Structure 1
Amino acid sequence: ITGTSTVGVGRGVLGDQKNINTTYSTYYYLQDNTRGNGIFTYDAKYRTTLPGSLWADADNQFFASYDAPAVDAHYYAGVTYDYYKNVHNRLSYDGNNAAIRSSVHYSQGYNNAFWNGSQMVYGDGDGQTFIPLSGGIDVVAHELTHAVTDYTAGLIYQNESGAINEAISDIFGTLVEFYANKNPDWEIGEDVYTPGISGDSLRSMSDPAKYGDPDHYSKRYTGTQDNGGVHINSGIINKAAYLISQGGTHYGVSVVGIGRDKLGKIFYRALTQYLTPTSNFSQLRAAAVQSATDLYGSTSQEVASVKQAFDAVGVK
């Protein structure tokens, strides 16, 4: 809508209070004019028509329990925008300030979220397996990272290219969680998954095997489920990125960690400068080595750790 930029206040899925950028025009809308061409949050009203209605609120106060998923989708979209702009000098997902659109209250008891090619979509979960998915900053950032990938490398969502696509979303989702500095970790989805069980998550980057995912190329899934294992084989690459950042010894191969900033820089360069829609794991290694070489020089510790990490996970 056209209106004037306002600042509302509300409570997210995890019960924390935060301010959100809104727009006033009769009602207050979840329309943040402060970032690029705007961040817009919609209500899908438990249906699957998309995007649904731009979120309207009479008083600019968002403390209703129905409000919470909207608050977080909107607020964490804003955090993710800020991450990409400040850390990578990337303006929104297309690098030209495209509007970021999210819908919440998608369907009934929907245990997932996704990027649909145009916007983000968040289920409310069924209350057992998931609580509303936009509650997890890593989830929000994972989904929006898919938009970044679509605009850059364009990795096809199947087999090895699809597992890289997934890993990219887990890596940057995690890097956004660290950037925001609320209870950051190398796990995925821990804030919204199984409210009945503490300490668990959907996937682990530091130890993929925790959740049944492979941590070495030799253990790759080769069947047809899950588009050829895109959320399974991502563990191989997630492990490599974890090792590059944090370091460690994995099946006797030792990796000197170089830290998150350098991980982010190397992978962002690889994504934007080298990968292609059909890149496979070996091509990713080449891209990451070449990116590290570009940034730090062929004889650097950074290049050496990239090579060691891909060695440790069996990617030649």
Structure 2
Amino acid sequence: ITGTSTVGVGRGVLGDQKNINTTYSTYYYLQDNTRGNGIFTYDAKYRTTLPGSLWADADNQFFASYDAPAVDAHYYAGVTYDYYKNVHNRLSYDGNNAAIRSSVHYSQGYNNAFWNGSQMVYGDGDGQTFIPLSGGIDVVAHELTHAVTDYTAGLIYQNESGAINEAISDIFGTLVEFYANKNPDWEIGEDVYTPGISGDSLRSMSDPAKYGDPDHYSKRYTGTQDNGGVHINSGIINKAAYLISQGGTHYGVSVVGIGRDKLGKIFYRALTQYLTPTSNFSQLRAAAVQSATDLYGSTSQEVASVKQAFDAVGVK
């Protein structure tokens, strides 16, 4: 909408106060004009029609329980935009400052979030498996990263390419969580998963097997559920990425860690210069090795560590 840029205040899903960029024209809308061609947050009103209505508020204060998922979807989309711009010199998901749209209050009791080809979509959860999913910065960044993937490598959402797609979203979801630097970890979704159980998460990158996901290629799933295991076999790549950053010895193979920033540089370059829609895990290894070679040199520690990490997870 046409209007003037304003600054509202509210509370997110976890009860924390934050400022949000809004637009005033009769109402205050969740429209942040400070980033690219805008970040826009919509109310799906417990239905499944998308996007729903651009979020309108009479007073620019967003402290109601109903407001909290919208506050966080809007704010964390801004953090994710900032990460891609400041860290990777990428302007929005398309590289040309496309408007970023999210809808909250999608459906009833909806235990998921997704990118629908055009926008992000967040359920409220059923209150037991999840609370509203936009409360997780790793979740928001996971979803926006699907848009980045779709505009770049275009990894098909099935089998190995789809597991790479998923891992890219978990990797950058985690790197955005570290960028914001509030309780960062190598777990996925811990802030919104199972409010009655402390210390758990939906997936672990540091130890995928904690939640039954493979941490070695010899343990990959090859059935048909979950699009051929895209959220399962992502554990093999998540583990490799964790090892590249943090190091460790895994199935007897030692990896020298190189840190998160270099992990992000290597995987961003692989995603945007080397991966294709049909890349498999072996092709990802080759893309990561080439990316590290471009950035750091063929004789570098960074190249050696990429090779170590893929060896550790059984990917040649």
**CA positional deviation for 1:25:** 0.2
**CA positional deviation for 1:155:** 0.1
**CA positional deviation for 1:236:** 0.1
After superposition, what is the alpha-carbon deviation per residue over 1:244-267, rounded to whole angstroms, capped at 9, x for unaligned?
000000000000000000000000
**Inter-partner Cα distance in structure 2 for 1:296 and 1:37:** 34
**TM-score, normalization: structure 1?**
1.00
3-state SS of paired residue (1:102): strand
**Inter-partner Cα distance in structure 2 for 1:231 and 1:266:** 22
After superposition, what is the alpha-carbon deviation per residue over 1:200-225, rounded to whole angstroms, capped at 9, x for unaligned?
00000000000000000000000000
3-state SS of paired residue (2:87): helix
3-state SS of paired residue (1:66): helix
**CA positional deviation for 1:227:** 0.1
**CA positional deviation for 1:14:** 0.4
After superposition, what is the alpha-carbon deviation per residue over 1:67-93, rounded to whole angstroms, capped at 9, x for unaligned?
000000000000000000000000000
3-state SS of paired residue (1:141): helix
**Inter-partner Cα distance in structure 1 for 2:296 and 2:136:** 34
After superposition, what is the alpha-carbon deviation per residue over 1:18-70, rounded to whole angstroms, capped at 9, x for unaligned?
00000000000000000000000000000000000000000000000000000
Stretches of structure 1 lacking an aligned partner (at least 5 in a row): none
Runs of 4+ in 1 over 6 A off after TM superposition: none
- Aligned CA RMSD, in angstroms, stands at 0.2
After superposition, what is the alpha-carbon deviation per residue over 1:159-199, rounded to whole angstroms, capped at 9, x for unaligned?
00000000000000000000000100000000000000000
**CA positional deviation for 1:5:** 0.2
Q: Name the counterpart of 2:16.
A: 16
**Inter-partner Cα distance in structure 1 for 2:87 and 2:210:** 31
3-state SS of paired residue (2:10): strand
**Inter-partner Cα distance in structure 2 for 1:273 and 1:161:** 16
What does residue range 196-207 of structure 1 map to in structure 2 within 5 Å? 196-207=196-207
**CA positional deviation for 1:304:** 0.1
Q: Name the counterpart of 1:62.
A: 62
Sequence identity percentage? 100
**Inter-partner Cα distance in structure 2 for 1:109 and 1:204:** 24
**Inter-partner Cα distance in structure 1 for 2:211 and 2:183:** 20
3-state SS of paired residue (1:67): helix
Q: Name the counterpart of 1:232.
A: 232
**Inter-partner Cα distance in structure 2 for 1:125 and 1:266:** 34
**Inter-partner Cα distance in structure 2 for 1:235 and 1:179:** 22
3-state SS of paired residue (1:18): strand
**Inter-partner Cα distance in structure 2 for 1:295 and 1:126:** 45
Count of residue correspondences? 316
Q: Name the counterpart of 1:276.
A: 276
**Inter-partner Cα distance in structure 2 for 1:126 and 1:272:** 37
Stretches of structure 2 lacking an aligned partner (at least 5 in a row): none
**CA positional deviation for 1:110:** 0.2
